[PDB]
Amino acid sequence: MTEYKLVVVGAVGVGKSALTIQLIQNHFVDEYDPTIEDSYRKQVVIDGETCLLDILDTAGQEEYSAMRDQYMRTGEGFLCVFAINNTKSFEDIHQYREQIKRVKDSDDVPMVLVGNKCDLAARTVESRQAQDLARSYGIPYIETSAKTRQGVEDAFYTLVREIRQH
Ligand SMILES: Nc1nc2c(ncn2[C@@H]2O[C@H](COP(=O)(O)OP(=O)(O)NP(=O)(O)O)[C@@H](O)[C@H]2O)c(=O)[nH]1
Ligand SMILES: [Mg+2]
């Protein structure tokens, strides 16, 4: 096995836990809506390689977390999540990427920009705008819905591939 340390970041309510839980769930527990940041594990085969993903579901910058800095030092790749119906969450992406750069002292950290809640008609962030932003960062952009499952595996596996290609 190869182990990957993934960190999910983004503003309050964008769907960080929903995404993480949807990926990692074994469905013994019907509904699980975590109230606190936590770490989860998932074994998956990605391109023939058996991967152990450790996924940290972080709190928004709005919440205090003592270990936030070490989380970013330990993290190998980051999913930067905003919601396509939440313009402020999109604008906040800059702050998450700056935090990661300040802590890791690097311009070249593996990351994927994730526009969540793509099941919703009430869109305020157009796909093209997010593609531009991801292009400016030199990272992939993937739209997801934790509710419909669209894009969820793709977002996480793309991040693993970014770590690999680093
Ligand atoms: N329509 C829709 N709602 C979603 C989606 N993902 C999450 N939600 C909803 O958005 C809300 C916030 O989700 P949650 O998973 O708690 O987000 P979070 O980013 O972990 N929040 P927090 O920062 O407070 O931990 C919940 O009501 C959840 O059901 C999605 O893809 N589509
Ligand atoms: Mg959460």
Side-chain angles (χ1 to χ4, degrees), residues 137-153:
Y137 297 167
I139 68 180
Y141 176 57
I142 295 162
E143 289 196 354
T144 62
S145 171
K147 295 277 159 185
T148 76
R149 284 46 144 175
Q150 171 175 345
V152 178
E153 289 196 289

PDB file of all heavy atoms in Angstrom, residues 137-153:
ATOM      1  N   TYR A 137      -3.771  29.322 -10.424  1.00  0.00           N
ATOM      2  CA  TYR A 137      -3.031  28.552  -9.422  1.00  0.00           C
ATOM      3  C   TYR A 137      -2.264  27.371 -10.023  1.00  0.00           C
ATOM      4  O   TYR A 137      -1.420  26.766  -9.349  1.00  0.00           O
ATOM      5  CB  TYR A 137      -3.984  27.979  -8.368  1.00  0.00           C
ATOM      6  CG  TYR A 137      -4.760  28.947  -7.507  1.00  0.00           C
ATOM      7  CD1 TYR A 137      -5.829  28.477  -6.744  1.00  0.00           C
ATOM      8  CD2 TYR A 137      -4.413  30.296  -7.398  1.00  0.00           C
ATOM      9  CE1 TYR A 137      -6.559  29.314  -5.913  1.00  0.00           C
ATOM     10  CE2 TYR A 137      -5.151  31.159  -6.561  1.00  0.00           C
ATOM     11  CZ  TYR A 137      -6.218  30.645  -5.817  1.00  0.00           C
ATOM     12  OH  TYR A 137      -6.973  31.444  -4.978  1.00  0.00           O
ATOM     13  N   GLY A 138      -2.584  27.015 -11.266  1.00  0.00           N
ATOM     14  CA  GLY A 138      -2.000  25.854 -11.923  1.00  0.00           C
ATOM     15  C   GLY A 138      -2.507  24.528 -11.382  1.00  0.00           C
ATOM     16  O   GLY A 138      -1.763  23.538 -11.370  1.00  0.00           O
ATOM     17  N   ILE A 139      -3.766  24.498 -10.931  1.00  0.00           N
ATOM     18  CA  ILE A 139      -4.353  23.279 -10.353  1.00  0.00           C
ATOM     19  C   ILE A 139      -5.623  22.825 -11.103  1.00  0.00           C
ATOM     20  O   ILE A 139      -6.235  23.622 -11.815  1.00  0.00           O
ATOM     21  CB  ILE A 139      -4.622  23.433  -8.814  1.00  0.00           C
ATOM     22  CG1 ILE A 139      -5.734  24.459  -8.527  1.00  0.00           C
ATOM     23  CG2 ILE A 139      -3.309  23.782  -8.072  1.00  0.00           C
ATOM     24  CD1 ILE A 139      -6.043  24.652  -6.999  1.00  0.00           C
ATOM     25  N   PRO A 140      -6.013  21.544 -10.951  1.00  0.00           N
ATOM     26  CA  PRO A 140      -7.292  21.092 -11.504  1.00  0.00           C
ATOM     27  C   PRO A 140      -8.511  21.731 -10.815  1.00  0.00           C
ATOM     28  O   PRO A 140      -8.424  22.126  -9.650  1.00  0.00           O
ATOM     29  CB  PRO A 140      -7.281  19.578 -11.258  1.00  0.00           C
ATOM     30  CG  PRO A 140      -5.842  19.221 -10.980  1.00  0.00           C
ATOM     31  CD  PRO A 140      -5.214  20.435 -10.387  1.00  0.00           C
ATOM     32  N   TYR A 141      -9.608  21.874 -11.565  1.00  0.00           N
ATOM     33  CA  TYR A 141     -10.901  22.265 -11.021  1.00  0.00           C
ATOM     34  C   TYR A 141     -11.927  21.160 -11.288  1.00  0.00           C
ATOM     35  O   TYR A 141     -12.049  20.706 -12.429  1.00  0.00           O
ATOM     36  CB  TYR A 141     -11.398  23.563 -11.669  1.00  0.00           C
ATOM     37  CG  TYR A 141     -12.785  23.979 -11.211  1.00  0.00           C
ATOM     38  CD1 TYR A 141     -13.067  24.185  -9.847  1.00  0.00           C
ATOM     39  CD2 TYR A 141     -13.811  24.176 -12.139  1.00  0.00           C
ATOM     40  CE1 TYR A 141     -14.342  24.571  -9.417  1.00  0.00           C
ATOM     41  CE2 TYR A 141     -15.082  24.575 -11.729  1.00  0.00           C
ATOM     42  CZ  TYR A 141     -15.343  24.767 -10.368  1.00  0.00           C
ATOM     43  OH  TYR A 141     -16.592  25.153  -9.967  1.00  0.00           O
ATOM     44  N   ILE A 142     -12.654  20.741 -10.249  1.00  0.00           N
ATOM     45  CA  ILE A 142     -13.661  19.685 -10.356  1.00  0.00           C
ATOM     46  C   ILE A 142     -14.916  20.119  -9.603  1.00  0.00           C
ATOM     47  O   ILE A 142     -14.825  20.554  -8.451  1.00  0.00           O
ATOM     48  CB  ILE A 142     -13.143  18.333  -9.784  1.00  0.00           C
ATOM     49  CG1 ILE A 142     -11.984  17.825 -10.638  1.00  0.00           C
ATOM     50  CG2 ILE A 142     -14.285  17.254  -9.742  1.00  0.00           C
ATOM     51  CD1 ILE A 142     -11.140  16.791  -9.968  1.00  0.00           C
ATOM     52  N   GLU A 143     -16.073  20.028 -10.260  1.00  0.00           N
ATOM     53  CA  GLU A 143     -17.332  20.324  -9.585  1.00  0.00           C
ATOM     54  C   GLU A 143     -17.924  19.056  -8.998  1.00  0.00           C
ATOM     55  O   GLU A 143     -17.878  17.987  -9.608  1.00  0.00           O
ATOM     56  CB  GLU A 143     -18.314  21.038 -10.528  1.00  0.00           C
ATOM     57  CG  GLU A 143     -17.858  22.477 -10.801  1.00  0.00           C
ATOM     58  CD  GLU A 143     -18.935  23.378 -11.403  1.00  0.00           C
ATOM     59  OE1 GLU A 143     -20.035  22.875 -11.731  1.00  0.00           O
ATOM     60  OE2 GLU A 143     -18.669  24.603 -11.551  1.00  0.00           O
ATOM     61  N   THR A 144     -18.469  19.172  -7.793  1.00  0.00           N
ATOM     62  CA  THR A 144     -18.970  18.003  -7.088  1.00  0.00           C
ATOM     63  C   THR A 144     -20.340  18.285  -6.507  1.00  0.00           C
ATOM     64  O   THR A 144     -20.724  19.443  -6.335  1.00  0.00           O
ATOM     65  CB  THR A 144     -18.043  17.616  -5.893  1.00  0.00           C
ATOM     66  OG1 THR A 144     -18.024  18.694  -4.951  1.00  0.00           O
ATOM     67  CG2 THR A 144     -16.603  17.335  -6.358  1.00  0.00           C
ATOM     68  N   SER A 145     -21.068  17.211  -6.209  1.00  0.00           N
ATOM     69  CA  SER A 145     -22.223  17.282  -5.332  1.00  0.00           C
ATOM     70  C   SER A 145     -22.120  16.133  -4.340  1.00  0.00           C
ATOM     71  O   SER A 145     -22.164  14.966  -4.735  1.00  0.00           O
ATOM     72  CB  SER A 145     -23.534  17.153  -6.108  1.00  0.00           C
ATOM     73  OG  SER A 145     -24.617  17.015  -5.185  1.00  0.00           O
ATOM     74  N   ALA A 146     -21.977  16.460  -3.060  1.00  0.00           N
ATOM     75  CA  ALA A 146     -22.026  15.430  -2.015  1.00  0.00           C
ATOM     76  C   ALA A 146     -23.402  14.761  -1.950  1.00  0.00           C
ATOM     77  O   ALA A 146     -23.513  13.620  -1.481  1.00  0.00           O
ATOM     78  CB  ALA A 146     -21.647  16.006  -0.663  1.00  0.00           C
ATOM     79  N   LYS A 147     -24.436  15.469  -2.413  1.00  0.00           N
ATOM     80  CA  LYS A 147     -25.810  14.951  -2.381  1.00  0.00           C
ATOM     81  C   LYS A 147     -26.088  13.930  -3.478  1.00  0.00           C
ATOM     82  O   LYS A 147     -26.669  12.870  -3.197  1.00  0.00           O
ATOM     83  CB  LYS A 147     -26.852  16.083  -2.452  1.00  0.00           C
ATOM     84  CG  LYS A 147     -26.849  17.019  -1.259  1.00  0.00           C
ATOM     85  CD  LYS A 147     -27.655  16.482  -0.097  1.00  0.00           C
ATOM     86  CE  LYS A 147     -27.223  17.140   1.209  1.00  0.00           C
ATOM     87  NZ  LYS A 147     -27.944  16.530   2.376  1.00  0.00           N
ATOM     88  N   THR A 148     -25.690  14.236  -4.717  1.00  0.00           N
ATOM     89  CA  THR A 148     -25.895  13.305  -5.843  1.00  0.00           C
ATOM     90  C   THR A 148     -24.720  12.338  -6.048  1.00  0.00           C
ATOM     91  O   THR A 148     -24.830  11.381  -6.819  1.00  0.00           O
ATOM     92  CB  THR A 148     -26.142  14.037  -7.185  1.00  0.00           C
ATOM     93  OG1 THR A 148     -24.912  14.568  -7.696  1.00  0.00           O
ATOM     94  CG2 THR A 148     -27.180  15.148  -7.045  1.00  0.00           C
ATOM     95  N   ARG A 149     -23.601  12.616  -5.375  1.00  0.00           N
ATOM     96  CA  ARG A 149     -22.338  11.862  -5.502  1.00  0.00           C
ATOM     97  C   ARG A 149     -21.495  12.280  -6.710  1.00  0.00           C
ATOM     98  O   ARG A 149     -20.368  11.822  -6.869  1.00  0.00           O
ATOM     99  CB  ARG A 149     -22.569  10.339  -5.516  1.00  0.00           C
ATOM    100  CG  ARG A 149     -22.875   9.678  -4.163  1.00  0.00           C
ATOM    101  CD  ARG A 149     -23.908  10.385  -3.285  1.00  0.00           C
ATOM    102  NE  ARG A 149     -24.730   9.427  -2.536  1.00  0.00           N
ATOM    103  CZ  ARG A 149     -25.648   9.752  -1.621  1.00  0.00           C
ATOM    104  NH1 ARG A 149     -25.885  11.026  -1.309  1.00  0.00           N
ATOM    105  NH2 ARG A 149     -26.341   8.796  -1.002  1.00  0.00           N
ATOM    106  N   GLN A 150     -22.024  13.160  -7.552  1.00  0.00           N
ATOM    107  CA  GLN A 150     -21.304  13.586  -8.746  1.00  0.00           C
ATOM    108  C   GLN A 150     -19.944  14.177  -8.377  1.00  0.00           C
ATOM    109  O   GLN A 150     -19.868  15.074  -7.554  1.00  0.00           O
ATOM    110  CB  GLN A 150     -22.104  14.625  -9.533  1.00  0.00           C
ATOM    111  CG  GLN A 150     -21.294  15.271 -10.692  1.00  0.00           C
ATOM    112  CD  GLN A 150     -22.115  16.217 -11.564  1.00  0.00           C
ATOM    113  OE1 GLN A 150     -23.342  16.216 -11.512  1.00  0.00           O
ATOM    114  NE2 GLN A 150     -21.433  17.019 -12.385  1.00  0.00           N
ATOM    115  N   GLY A 151     -18.884  13.649  -8.977  1.00  0.00           N
ATOM    116  CA  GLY A 151     -17.564  14.279  -8.901  1.00  0.00           C
ATOM    117  C   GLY A 151     -16.749  13.933  -7.670  1.00  0.00           C
ATOM    118  O   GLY A 151     -15.561  14.232  -7.629  1.00  0.00           O
ATOM    119  N   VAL A 152     -17.389  13.317  -6.676  1.00  0.00           N
ATOM    120  CA  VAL A 152     -16.771  13.111  -5.364  1.00  0.00           C
ATOM    121  C   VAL A 152     -15.502  12.244  -5.449  1.00  0.00           C
ATOM    122  O   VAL A 152     -14.447  12.680  -5.026  1.00  0.00           O
ATOM    123  CB  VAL A 152     -17.759  12.582  -4.276  1.00  0.00           C
ATOM    124  CG1 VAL A 152     -17.009  12.350  -2.952  1.00  0.00           C
ATOM    125  CG2 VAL A 152     -18.897  13.573  -4.036  1.00  0.00           C
ATOM    126  N   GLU A 153     -15.613  11.033  -5.999  1.00  0.00           N
ATOM    127  CA  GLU A 153     -14.438  10.184  -6.201  1.00  0.00           C
ATOM    128  C   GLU A 153     -13.413  10.861  -7.098  1.00  0.00           C
ATOM    129  O   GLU A 153     -12.220  10.828  -6.815  1.00  0.00           O
ATOM    130  CB  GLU A 153     -14.822   8.816  -6.784  1.00  0.00           C
ATOM    131  CG  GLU A 153     -15.553   7.914  -5.799  1.00  0.00           C
ATOM    132  CD  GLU A 153     -15.561   6.472  -6.249  1.00  0.00           C
ATOM    133  OE1 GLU A 153     -16.272   6.146  -7.224  1.00  0.00           O
ATOM    134  OE2 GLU A 153     -14.852   5.664  -5.620  1.00  0.00           O
TER     135      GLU A 153
END
